[PDB]
Coordinates of C-alpha atoms in Angstrom, one line a residue:
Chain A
X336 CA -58.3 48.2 -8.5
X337 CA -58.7 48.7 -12.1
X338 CA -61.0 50.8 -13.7
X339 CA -60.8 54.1 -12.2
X340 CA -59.7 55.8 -15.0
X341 CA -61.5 53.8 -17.6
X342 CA -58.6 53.1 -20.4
X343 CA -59.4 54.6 -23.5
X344 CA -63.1 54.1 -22.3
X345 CA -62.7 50.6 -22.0
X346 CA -63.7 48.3 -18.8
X347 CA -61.7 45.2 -18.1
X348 CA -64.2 42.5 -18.2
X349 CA -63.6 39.2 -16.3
X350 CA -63.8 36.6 -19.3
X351 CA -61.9 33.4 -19.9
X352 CA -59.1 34.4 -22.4
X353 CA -55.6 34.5 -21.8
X354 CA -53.3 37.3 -21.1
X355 CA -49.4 36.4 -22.2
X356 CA -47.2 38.1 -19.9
X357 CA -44.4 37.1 -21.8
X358 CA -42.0 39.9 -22.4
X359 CA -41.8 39.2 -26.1
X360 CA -45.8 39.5 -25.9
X361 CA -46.7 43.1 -27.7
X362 CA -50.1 42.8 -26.1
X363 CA -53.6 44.9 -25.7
X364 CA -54.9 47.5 -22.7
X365 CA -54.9 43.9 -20.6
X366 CA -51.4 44.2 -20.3
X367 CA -52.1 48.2 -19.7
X368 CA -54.3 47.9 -17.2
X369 CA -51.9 45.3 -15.6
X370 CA -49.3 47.9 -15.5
X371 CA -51.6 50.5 -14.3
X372 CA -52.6 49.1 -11.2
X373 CA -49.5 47.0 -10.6
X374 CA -47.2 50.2 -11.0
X375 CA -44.7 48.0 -12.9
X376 CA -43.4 47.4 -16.3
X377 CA -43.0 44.8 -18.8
X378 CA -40.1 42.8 -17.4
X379 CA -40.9 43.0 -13.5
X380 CA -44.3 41.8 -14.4
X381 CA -42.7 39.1 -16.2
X382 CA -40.7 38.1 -13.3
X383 CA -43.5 38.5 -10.9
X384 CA -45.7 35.7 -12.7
X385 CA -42.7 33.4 -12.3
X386 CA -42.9 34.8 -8.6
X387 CA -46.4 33.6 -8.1
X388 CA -46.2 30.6 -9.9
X389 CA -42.8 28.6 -10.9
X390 CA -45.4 26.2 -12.7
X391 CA -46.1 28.4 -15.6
X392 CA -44.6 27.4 -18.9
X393 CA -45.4 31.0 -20.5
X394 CA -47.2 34.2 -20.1
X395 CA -50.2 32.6 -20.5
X396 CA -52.2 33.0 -17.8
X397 CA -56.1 32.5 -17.3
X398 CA -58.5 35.5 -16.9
X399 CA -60.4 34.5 -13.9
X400 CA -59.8 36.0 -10.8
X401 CA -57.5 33.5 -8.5
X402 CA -55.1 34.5 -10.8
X403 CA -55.3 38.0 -10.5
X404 CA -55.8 37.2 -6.5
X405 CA -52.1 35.3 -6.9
X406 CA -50.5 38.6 -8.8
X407 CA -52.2 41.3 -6.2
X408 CA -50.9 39.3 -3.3
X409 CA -47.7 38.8 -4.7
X410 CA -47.2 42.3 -5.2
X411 CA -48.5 42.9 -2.0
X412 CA -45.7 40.7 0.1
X413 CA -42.9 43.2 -1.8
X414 CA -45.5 46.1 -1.1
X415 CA -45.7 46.1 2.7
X416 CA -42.0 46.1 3.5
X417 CA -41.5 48.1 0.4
X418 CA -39.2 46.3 -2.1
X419 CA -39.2 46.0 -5.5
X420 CA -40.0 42.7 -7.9
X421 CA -36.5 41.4 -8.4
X422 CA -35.6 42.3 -4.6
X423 CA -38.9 40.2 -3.6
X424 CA -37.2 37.2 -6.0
X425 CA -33.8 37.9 -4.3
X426 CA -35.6 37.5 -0.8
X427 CA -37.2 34.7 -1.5
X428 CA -34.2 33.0 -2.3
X429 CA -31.8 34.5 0.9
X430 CA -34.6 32.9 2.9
X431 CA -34.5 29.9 1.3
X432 CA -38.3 29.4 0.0
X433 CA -37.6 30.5 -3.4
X434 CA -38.6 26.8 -4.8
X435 CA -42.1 26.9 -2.8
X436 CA -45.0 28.2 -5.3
X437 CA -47.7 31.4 -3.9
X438 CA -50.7 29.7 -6.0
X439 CA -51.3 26.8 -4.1
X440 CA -50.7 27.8 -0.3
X441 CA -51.8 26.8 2.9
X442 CA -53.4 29.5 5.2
X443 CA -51.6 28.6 8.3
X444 CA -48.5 28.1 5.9
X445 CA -48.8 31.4 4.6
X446 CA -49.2 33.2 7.8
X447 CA -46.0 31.8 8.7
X448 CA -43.8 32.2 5.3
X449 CA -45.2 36.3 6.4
X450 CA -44.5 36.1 9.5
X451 CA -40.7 34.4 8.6
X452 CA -40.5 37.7 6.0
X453 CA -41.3 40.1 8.7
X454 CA -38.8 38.8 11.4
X455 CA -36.4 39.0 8.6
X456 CA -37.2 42.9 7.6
X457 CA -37.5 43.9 11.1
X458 CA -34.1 42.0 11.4
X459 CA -32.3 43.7 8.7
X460 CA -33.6 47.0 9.9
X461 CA -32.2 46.4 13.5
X462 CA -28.9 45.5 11.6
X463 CA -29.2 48.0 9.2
X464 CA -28.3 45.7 6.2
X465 CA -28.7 46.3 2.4
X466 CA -30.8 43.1 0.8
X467 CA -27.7 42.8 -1.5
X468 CA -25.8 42.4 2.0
X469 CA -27.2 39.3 2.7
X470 CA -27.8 38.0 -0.2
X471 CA -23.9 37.9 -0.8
X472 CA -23.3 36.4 2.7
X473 CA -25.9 34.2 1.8
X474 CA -25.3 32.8 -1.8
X475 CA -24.3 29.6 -2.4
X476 CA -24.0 29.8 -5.8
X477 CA -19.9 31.1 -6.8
X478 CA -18.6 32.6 -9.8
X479 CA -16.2 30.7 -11.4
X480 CA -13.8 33.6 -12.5
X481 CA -9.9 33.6 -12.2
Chain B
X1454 CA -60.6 72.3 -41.1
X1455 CA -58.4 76.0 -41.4
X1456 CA -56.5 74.6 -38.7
X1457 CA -56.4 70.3 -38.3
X1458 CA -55.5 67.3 -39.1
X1459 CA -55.9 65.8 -35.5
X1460 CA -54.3 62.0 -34.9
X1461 CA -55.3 61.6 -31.3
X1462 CA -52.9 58.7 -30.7
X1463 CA -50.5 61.1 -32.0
X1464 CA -51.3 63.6 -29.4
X1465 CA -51.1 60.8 -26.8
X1466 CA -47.6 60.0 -28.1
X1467 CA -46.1 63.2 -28.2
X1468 CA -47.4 64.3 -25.0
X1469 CA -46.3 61.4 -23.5
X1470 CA -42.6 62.3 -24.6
X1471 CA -42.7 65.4 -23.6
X1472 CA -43.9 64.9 -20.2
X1473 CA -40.8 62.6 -19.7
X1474 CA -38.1 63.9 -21.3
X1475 CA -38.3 68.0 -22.0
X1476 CA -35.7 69.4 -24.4
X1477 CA -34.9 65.7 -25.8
X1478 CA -31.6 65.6 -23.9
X1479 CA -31.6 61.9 -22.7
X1480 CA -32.6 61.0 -26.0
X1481 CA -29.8 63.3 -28.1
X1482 CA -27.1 62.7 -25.5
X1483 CA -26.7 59.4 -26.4
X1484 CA -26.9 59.5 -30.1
X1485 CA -27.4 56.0 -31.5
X1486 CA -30.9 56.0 -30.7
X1487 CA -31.1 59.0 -32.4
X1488 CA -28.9 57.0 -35.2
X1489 CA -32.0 55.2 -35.5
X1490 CA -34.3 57.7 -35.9
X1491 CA -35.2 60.3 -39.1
X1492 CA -35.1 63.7 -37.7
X1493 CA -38.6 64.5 -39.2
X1494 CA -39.8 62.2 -36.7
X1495 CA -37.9 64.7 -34.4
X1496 CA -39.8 67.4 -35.4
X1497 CA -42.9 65.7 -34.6
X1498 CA -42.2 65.6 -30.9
X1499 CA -41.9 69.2 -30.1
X1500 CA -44.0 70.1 -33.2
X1501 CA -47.2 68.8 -33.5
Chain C
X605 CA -14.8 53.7 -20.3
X606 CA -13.2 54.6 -17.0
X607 CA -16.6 56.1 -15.6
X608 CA -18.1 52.9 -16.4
X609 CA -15.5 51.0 -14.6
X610 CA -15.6 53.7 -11.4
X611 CA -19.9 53.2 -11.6
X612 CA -18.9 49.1 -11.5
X613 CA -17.0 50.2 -8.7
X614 CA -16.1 46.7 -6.1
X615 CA -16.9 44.3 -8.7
X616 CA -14.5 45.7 -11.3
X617 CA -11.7 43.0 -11.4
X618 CA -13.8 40.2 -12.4
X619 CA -16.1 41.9 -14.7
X620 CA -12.6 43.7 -16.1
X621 CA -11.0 39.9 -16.8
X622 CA -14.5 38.5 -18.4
X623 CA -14.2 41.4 -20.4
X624 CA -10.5 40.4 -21.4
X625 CA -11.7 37.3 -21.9
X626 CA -13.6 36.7 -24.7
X627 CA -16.6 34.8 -22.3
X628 CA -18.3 37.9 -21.0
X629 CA -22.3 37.4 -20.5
X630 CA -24.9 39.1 -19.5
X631 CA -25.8 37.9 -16.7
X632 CA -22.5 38.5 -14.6
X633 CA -23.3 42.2 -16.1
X634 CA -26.0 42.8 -14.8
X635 CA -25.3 41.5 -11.7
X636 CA -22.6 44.6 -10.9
X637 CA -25.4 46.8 -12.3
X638 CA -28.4 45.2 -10.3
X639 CA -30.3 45.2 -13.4
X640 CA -32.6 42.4 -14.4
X641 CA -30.5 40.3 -16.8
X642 CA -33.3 40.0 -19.2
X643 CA -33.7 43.9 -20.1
X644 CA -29.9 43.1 -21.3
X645 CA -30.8 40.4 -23.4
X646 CA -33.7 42.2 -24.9
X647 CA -31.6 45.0 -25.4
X648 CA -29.2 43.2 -27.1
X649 CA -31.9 41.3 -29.0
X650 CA -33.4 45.0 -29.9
X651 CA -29.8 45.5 -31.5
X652 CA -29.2 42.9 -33.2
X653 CA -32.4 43.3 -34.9
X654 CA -31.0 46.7 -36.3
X655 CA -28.5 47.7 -37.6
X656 CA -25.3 45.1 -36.7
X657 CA -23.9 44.5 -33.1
X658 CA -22.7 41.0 -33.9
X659 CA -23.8 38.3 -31.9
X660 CA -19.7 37.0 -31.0
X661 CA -19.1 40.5 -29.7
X662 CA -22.6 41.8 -28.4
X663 CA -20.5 41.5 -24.8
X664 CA -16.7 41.4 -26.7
X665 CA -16.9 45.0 -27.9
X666 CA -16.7 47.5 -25.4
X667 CA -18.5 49.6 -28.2
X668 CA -21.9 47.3 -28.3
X669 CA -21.8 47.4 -24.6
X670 CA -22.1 51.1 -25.1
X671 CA -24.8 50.8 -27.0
X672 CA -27.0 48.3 -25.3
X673 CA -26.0 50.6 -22.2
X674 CA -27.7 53.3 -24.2
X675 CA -30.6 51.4 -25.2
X676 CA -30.9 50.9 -21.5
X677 CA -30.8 54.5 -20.7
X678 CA -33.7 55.1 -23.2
X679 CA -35.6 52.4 -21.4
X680 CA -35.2 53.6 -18.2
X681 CA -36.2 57.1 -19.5
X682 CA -39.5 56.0 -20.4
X683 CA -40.2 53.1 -18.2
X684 CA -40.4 50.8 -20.7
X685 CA -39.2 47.3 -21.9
X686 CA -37.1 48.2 -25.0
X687 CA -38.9 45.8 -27.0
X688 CA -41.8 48.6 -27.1
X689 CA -39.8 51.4 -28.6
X690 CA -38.6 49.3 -31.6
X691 CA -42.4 49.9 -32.9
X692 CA -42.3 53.5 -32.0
X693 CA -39.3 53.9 -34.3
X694 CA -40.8 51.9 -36.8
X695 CA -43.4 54.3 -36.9
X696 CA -41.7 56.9 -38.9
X697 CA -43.1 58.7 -41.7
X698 CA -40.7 58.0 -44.3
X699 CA -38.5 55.2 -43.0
X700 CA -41.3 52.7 -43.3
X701 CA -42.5 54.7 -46.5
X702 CA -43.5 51.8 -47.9
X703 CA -45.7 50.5 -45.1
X704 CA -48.1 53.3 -43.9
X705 CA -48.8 52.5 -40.1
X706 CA -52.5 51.9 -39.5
X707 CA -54.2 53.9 -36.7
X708 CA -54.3 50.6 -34.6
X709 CA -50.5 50.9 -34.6
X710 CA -50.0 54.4 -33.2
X711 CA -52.9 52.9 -30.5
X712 CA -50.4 50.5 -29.7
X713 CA -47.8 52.1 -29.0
X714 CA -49.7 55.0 -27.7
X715 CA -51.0 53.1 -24.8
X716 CA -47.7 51.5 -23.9
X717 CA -46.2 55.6 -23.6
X718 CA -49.3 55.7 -21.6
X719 CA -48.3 52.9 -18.9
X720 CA -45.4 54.5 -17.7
X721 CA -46.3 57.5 -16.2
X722 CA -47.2 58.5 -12.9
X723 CA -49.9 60.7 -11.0
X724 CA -48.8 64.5 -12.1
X725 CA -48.6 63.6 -15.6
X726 CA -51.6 61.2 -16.3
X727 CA -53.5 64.1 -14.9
X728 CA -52.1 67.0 -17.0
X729 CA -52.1 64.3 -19.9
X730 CA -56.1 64.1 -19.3
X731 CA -56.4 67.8 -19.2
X732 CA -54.7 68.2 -22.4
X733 CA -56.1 65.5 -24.4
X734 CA -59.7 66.5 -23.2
X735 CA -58.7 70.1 -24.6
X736 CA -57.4 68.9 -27.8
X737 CA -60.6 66.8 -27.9
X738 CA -63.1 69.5 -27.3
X739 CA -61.5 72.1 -30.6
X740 CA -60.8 68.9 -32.6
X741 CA -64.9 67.7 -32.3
X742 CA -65.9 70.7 -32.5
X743 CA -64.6 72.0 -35.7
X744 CA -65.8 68.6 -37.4
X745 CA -69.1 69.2 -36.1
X746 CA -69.1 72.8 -37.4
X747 CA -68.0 71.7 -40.5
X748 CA -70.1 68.6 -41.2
X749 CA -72.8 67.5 -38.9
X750 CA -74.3 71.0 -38.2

């Protein structure tokens, strides 16, 4: 996952120091190697972490490895009907579970929130929809705008 | 050396620019970026 | 300024009065983009930490909108938040002639060029660095050590 290439000869070592994923962070090769295997940049990253856990305060996360578990998977539920970070976040909100939190999950609750995303892909490709599409048929939220 | 100095972040740096951008069009097209910029900067991109 | 409003496109008319108002954000900008709205507002933060696009008109002035637009095309050049190339140009030779950059620096921001490339060119980068490595060692060695 990450250290194939070694970055600048470095391993990532499991410890217990944060990592700030805040975008104002300016931070080492663990934000690097982040990026590297996450195929992502700062700000998607930064909106990922909110993804996996509306609880955080900050980009201060723990270095063990549920955490990392949380960001992979994350990534992973955009990855296998290929979307992006912010169309993942959009998603989650058209389907209504945007308040519900990936780092404290029930198994069988899990299996079903994938399940709920797949009828929904496999729906949209049937109707041949743009996520934008129903997001806009979808909103609640209205701009205020004469 | 008859032929150094050698930064090797440098290298990283320049190559890095010009594996994305050749000819340093996006970044002279729009020019207040290169507003920012001195050109002898410039000249270390395609220069080493 | 009319190919920007042609790229808007179906959202023009209330983008166009926001803009003829003097309450135009961010975030109803990026939403006719579909940008994040936070690589705006870093953008404009980036800005406004050079030389002056004043905070009232950061979004009144069609002129700072062309600007952060072009700090957003720099960004999306290189993959990268635009928070990360305000140390790149502040590591000029003589602009910050008074503070030499330290080699840590150009490490810095050497490794966040580094994040944002793909397979073709993290391989040729390798190549090349590994050649520039060998005749830069060498010589050294020649010189020095033998």
């Amino acid at each position: 996952l990450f250290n194939t290439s070694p970055l600048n000869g470095q391993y990532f070592v499991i410890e217990d120091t944060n990592i700030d994923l805040s975008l104002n962070s300016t931070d080492n090769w663990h934000k690097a190697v982040l990026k590297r295997a996450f195929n992502v940049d700062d700000i998607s990253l930064y909106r990922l972490l909110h993804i996996a856990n509306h609880n955080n305060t900050d980009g201060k996360i723990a270095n063990n490895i549920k955490n990392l578990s949380n960001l992979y998977m994350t990534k992973l539920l955009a990855d296998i009907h290929q979307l992006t970070i912010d169309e993942l976040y959009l998603l989650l909100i058209t389907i209504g579970e945007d308040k519900i939190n990936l780092y404290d999950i029930d198994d069988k609750e899990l299996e079903k929130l994938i399940n709920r995303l797949d009828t929904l892909s496999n729906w949209l490709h049937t109707q041949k929809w743009s996520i934008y599409q129903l997001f806009l048929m979808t909103t609640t939220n209205y701009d205020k705008t004469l | 050396s008859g032929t150094i100095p050698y930064h090797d972040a440098y290298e990283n740096v320049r190559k890095a620019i010009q594996l994305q951008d050749p000819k340093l069009e996006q970044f002279q097209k729009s020019p207040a970026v290169a507003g920012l910029m001195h050109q002898a900067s410039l000249l270390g991109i395609n220069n080493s | 300024f009319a190919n920007w409003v042609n790229s808007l496109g179906e959202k023009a008319s209330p983008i166009l009065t926001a803009f003829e108002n003097k309450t135009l954000t961010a975030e109803k900008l990026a939403n006719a983009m579909n940008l994040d709205a936070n690589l705006l507002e870093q953008a404009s933060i980036q800005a406004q930490n050079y030389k002056q696009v004043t905070k009232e008109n950061t979004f009144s002035n069609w002129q700072s909108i062309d600007i952060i637009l072009q700090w957003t095309n720099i960004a999306s050049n290189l993959n990268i938040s635009p928070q990360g190339i305000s140390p790149l140009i502040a590591l000029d030779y003589i602009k910050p002639a008074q503070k030499t950059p330290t080699y840590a620096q150009w490490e810095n921001a050497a490794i966040a060029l580094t994040a944002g490339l793909d397979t073709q060119q993290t391989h040729t980068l390798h190549v090349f660095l590994d050649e520039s490595r060998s005749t830069a060692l060498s010589n050294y060695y020649i010189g020095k050590v033998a």
